[PDB]
Design a protein around this ligand. Structure first.
Ligand SMILES: Nc1nc2c(ncn2[C@@H]2O[C@H](COP(=O)(O)OP(=O)(O)O)[C@@H](O)[C@H]2O)c(=O)[nH]1
Ligand SMILES: [Mg+2]
Lengths: 247, 155, 424, 119
């Protein structure tokens, strides 16, 4: 007995909804112009709907201006309401963000994990979770690693927590020649150890989960090689999470 | 609603447009969401002519809101000495209490409005009045290192 | 660990900031043109710390402040590029300084910070002067701090933050601004000197007998304190030499890094002090709460760590004796579970116009009194929800106030915990 | 080196069999190209008939742990293995007078029997 996708429900189109005074309001110098412009389409145009139009709808003009703010916009509020827009698209339009869409917002989002305001990290991470659950691990696996290597302490801990989030919901079943194994020891492990051996404890402690969520996926015997090279003292922290963690 | 426009004006402080709205018979004691009359709002933000205009048109000088705040509370909190004496002259409740147990004397003492403290005191403020936690205006001066206020409270 | 980048933000920031540069320029023998007319090597021994010309960046949304600095005495010395100023002012709105207007400008400032850091042999850390009840010094300063913290996480962040008091400005939104700013400093700075205007007025009024203190009068006490606490940093010396070592021996718990500064002797603006004090007299200006720049009673709490800086020619033998004395004769006031928590250092070059002086940096749990005052004023204001539409209009959420309120109260509780702690 | 598994002296072959037995515990489930004791099964067919009773038994317990390290995917090449291996295992492992040399040879055949589709 197979199940249904409830997604069969007819789709809705939002392109006609946008107003003429939208592009200039988002591309304005006055912060409240931008905020209201974004906030309007979120509360009026996206939040109501429950399924966007798959057929013949190009959002990669709208999505690249959400990225422009999420990355560069100095107003943390305009970021927050934008990443919640990005999530809504990726959520109400599942199976759309194959590359052009997903990749247009991916590396901007990972840059902005730098934000430490709880509400904002909430919105950015949850949107990263959206682009992941419908594009995992297309571009994110590689680019997530890149930003674990980044200089800002916050982006390290948050992009590593991201790999942890993704890894718990990592999916089967090809052969064991998925993108995770092709780059497992070469890249994933070499980069997770950089987190495990960070100067900060709160950083290191994210690596300890992100390594014990890794062993859970790919066998505590396969990775016993870099386990030995690790401190006996760090080892029992890694094992601590291994015993609690589920994927 | 004409009672809601009179709140917008009395708050933001457009002295002239109060007279316009009141000449259209607006409710002088119109309540907003949280029970705040225009007299509350003008007394918070220091619009002396708007206070005296509303009072002489029959504004409830001792009106409370959803939290038991009278306009004299809010004037003594923010520190509007001009308005405090206008309210008191129009029969304000010098020893009014709000939901947290504070009197206007509590708020003027906490915010360091020594000039308003003395005015309230001379209108028969309760110096020994306590709040929820059990603290008087005198305890606040002891707790807040304000020897200038301790002397003004025992005068 | 050599160079220090200095920043001043807001009106107060640039006022006590410039005053500080006035004081230590003289002490190091620099004229307003930027030329050495001293007569000692101990003056240019560690001039590379604060100078290149000052390593100072001047910041304000208020453009007028620009001129108030340059039209001052040592206003000519500051690098023209290091002036970074906005068009309008923040108007006592922390949200405008932290989220809206101050955020738009903060990039320009970081560009200059980068420029000055770029040409440093080995950076120590940063030094920000600002007021906490304002909109710019508090809102944009704390935003600047975080922005540096993440761009320079391997460096120290050291602030001279001045606390608002009704005795100096009757603006009632200052409790909001200062509470929001303390919520930042406890997470973003390694060490913070708490300059309390309440205490500066109480010293100018009661001890110095000035019936109306001006800013200049309060700023005199501040600039003299700053040169005192930075004496170790600016002259050769074994103890508390660099910013990190200082914080290492001053801050036992990361959140409890709010120092109660105080120094002696207390002088007026250019008055004469006949008979220079003796070593035991200076030492007895430590517990003397009338010398604390923060309005707190050290008697009402316990010292976690203490740094003493004696300036002038005097007996190192006698200073050691007096400090070893005053510690054990008040043994119940110094925490027992941190042995040798008081540290003393001497510098032979005295402060300007005085033969001897002594500055008393202390991590005292009594500082909770200061945060109590701010929180009660904040809560009184916040429970009636006054002036919230200012902050919320600039994109802030009402929740933030609750979090800052709660976070400051956790900070007060923590101080109370370690005060009641026992070694047993 | 590994090529010492066919060295003249017995105690050096005895090492390589222990070295191998570690390899099959400690190496990769997916498996290193160094794990090429499948596509030349003549190697272990030789090792099982070692010409030294002590180094023989150690080759059989290396074959044994090899032959259970191979219960990971994809090893459909167990047909070739039974042909090459159980005749040496039967002829000279079951044959053996040695308690442990025999017991592990039977266990090996077991593991080759369940590699197969049937008996
Ligand atoms: N000690 C001292 N305090 C000041 C000075 N100027 C302002 N303040 C205090 O700082 C607060 C006002 O903030 P201010 O720095 O003027 O606003 P900003 O320009 O937006 O940072 C109030 O608590 C004032 O008492 C000064 O020159 N010296
Ligand atoms: Mg200002």
């Amino acid at each position: 007995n197979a199940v249904d996708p409830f997604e069969l429900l007819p789709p809705s189109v939002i392109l006609d909804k946008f107003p003429a005074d939208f592009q200039t309001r988002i591309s304005s110098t006055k912060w409240k112009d931008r905020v209201e412009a974004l906030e309007e389409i979120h509360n009026n145009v996206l939040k109501p709907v429950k399924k966007l139009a798959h057929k013949n709808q190009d959002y990669s003009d709208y999505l690249r201006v959400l990225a422009n703010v999420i990355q560069k916009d100095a107003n943390v509020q305009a970021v927050t309401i934008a990443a919640n827009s990005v999530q809504l698209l990726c959520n109400s339009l599942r199976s759309n963000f194959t590359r052009s869409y997903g990749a247009i917002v991916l590396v901007p989002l990972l840059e902005r994990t730098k934000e430490k305001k709880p509400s904002v990290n909430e919105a950015i991470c949850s949107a990263l979770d959206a682009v992941a659950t419908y594009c995992g691990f297309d571009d994110c696996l590689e680019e997530t690693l890149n930003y674990m290597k980044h200089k800002t302490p916050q982006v390290r801990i948050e992009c590593t927590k991201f790999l942890t989030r993704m890894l718990q919901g990592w999916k089967s079943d090809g052969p064991l020649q998925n993108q995770l194994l092709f780059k497992l020891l070469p890249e994933v492990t070499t980069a997770v150890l950089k987190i495990v051996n960070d100067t900060q404890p709160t950083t290191r402690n994210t690596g300890f989960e992100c390594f014990a969520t890794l062993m859970k996926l790919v066998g505590e015997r396969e990775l016993a090689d870099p386990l030995e090279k690790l401190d006996n003292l760090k080892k029992k922290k890694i094992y601590e999470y291994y015993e609690k963690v589920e994927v | 609603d004409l009672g809601k426009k009179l709140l917008e004006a009395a708050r933001a402080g457009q002295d002239d447009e109060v007279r316009i709205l009141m000449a259209n018979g607006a409710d002088v004691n119109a309540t907003d969401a949280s029970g705040l009359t225009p007299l509350h709002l003008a007394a918070t933000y220091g619009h002396l002519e708007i206070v005296e205009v509303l009072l002489k048109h029959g504004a409830d000088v001792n009106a409370i809101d959803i939290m038991g705040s009278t306009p004299l509370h809010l004037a003594a909190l923010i520190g509007h000495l001009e308005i405090v004496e206008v309210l008191l002259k129009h029969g304000a409740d010098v020893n009014a209490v709000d939901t947290w147990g504070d009197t206007p004397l509590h708020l003027a003492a906490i915010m360091g409005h020594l000039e308003i403290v003395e005015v309230l005191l001379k209108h028969g403020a309760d110096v020994n009045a306590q709040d929820k936690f059990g603290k008087t205006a005198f305890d606040i001066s002891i707790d807040n290192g304000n020897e200038d206020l301790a002397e003004i409270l025992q005068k | 660990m050599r160079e220090i980048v200095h920043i001043q933000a807001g009106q107060c920031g640039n006022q006590i900031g410039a005053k500080f540069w006035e004081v230590i320029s003289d002490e190091h023998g620099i004229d307003p043109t930027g030329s050495y007319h001293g007569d000692s090597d101990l003056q240019l021994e560690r001039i590379n710390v604060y100078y290149n010309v000052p390593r100072a960046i001047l910041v304000d949304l208020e453009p007028g402040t620009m001129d108030s600095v340059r039209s001052g005495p040592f206003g000519q010395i500051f690098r023209p590029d290091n002036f970074v100023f906005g068009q309008s002012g923040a108007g006592n709105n922390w949200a405008k300084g932290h989220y809206t207007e101050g955020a738009e400008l903060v990039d320009s400032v970081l560009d200059v910070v980068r420029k000055e850091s770029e040409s440093c042999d080995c950076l120590q850390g940063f030094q920000l002067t600002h007021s906490l009840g304002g909109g710019t010094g508090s809102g944009m300063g704390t935003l600047l701090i975080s922005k540096i913290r993440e761009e320079y996480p391997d460096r120290i962040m050291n602030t001279f933050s001045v606390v608002p008091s009704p005795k100096v400005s009757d603006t009632v939104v200052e409790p909001y601004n200062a509470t929001l700013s303390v919520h930042q400093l406890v997470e973003n700075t390694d060490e913070t000197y708490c300059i309390d205007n309440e205490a500066l007025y109480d010293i100018c009024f009661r001890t110095l007998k000035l019936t109306t203190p001006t800013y200049g009068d309060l700023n005199h006490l501040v600039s003299a304190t700053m040169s005192g606490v930075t004496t170790c940093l600016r002259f050769p010396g074994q103890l508390n030499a660099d910013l990190r070592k200082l914080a290492v021996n001053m801050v036992p718990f990361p959140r409890l890094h709010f120092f109660m500064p105080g120094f002696a002797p207390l002088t007026s603006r250019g008055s004469q002090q006949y008979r220079a004090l003796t070593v035991p007299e200076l030492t007895q200006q430590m517990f003397d709460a009338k010398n604390m720049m923060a309005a707190c009673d050290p008697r009402h709490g316990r010292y976690l760590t203490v740094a003493a800086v004696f300036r002038g020619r005097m007996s190192m033998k006698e200073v050691d004796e007096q400090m070893l004395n005053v510690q054990n004769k008040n043994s119940s006031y110094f925490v027992e579970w941190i042995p040798n928590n008081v540290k003393t250092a001497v510098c032979d070059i005295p402060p300007r116009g005085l033969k001897m002086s002594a500055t008393f940096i202390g991590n005292s749990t009594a500082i909770q009194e200061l945060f109590k005052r701010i929180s009660e004023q904040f809560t009184a204001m916040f429970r009636r929800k006054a002036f919230l539409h200012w902050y919320t209009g600039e994109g802030m959420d009402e929740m933030e106030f609750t979090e800052a309120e709660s976070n400051m109260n956790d900070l007060v509780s923590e101080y109370q915990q370690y005060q009641d702690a026992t070694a047993d | 080196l590994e090529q010492r598994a066919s060295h003249k002296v017995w105690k050096a072959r005895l090492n390589a069999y222990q070295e191998l037995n570690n390899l099959f515990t400690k190496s990769s489930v997916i498996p290193n190209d160094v794990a090429n004791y499948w596509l030349d099964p003549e190697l272990f067919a030789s090792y099982i008939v070692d010409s030294n009773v002590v180094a023989q038994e150690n080759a059989i317990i290396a074959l044994h742990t090899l032959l259970e390290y191979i219960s990971q995917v994809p090893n459909v090449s167990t047909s070739k293995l039974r042909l090459q291996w159980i005749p040496p295992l039967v002829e000279k492992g079951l044959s053996s007078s040695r308690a442990a040399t025999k017991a592990k040879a039977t266990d090996c055949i077991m593991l080759l029997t369940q590699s197969d589709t049937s008996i």
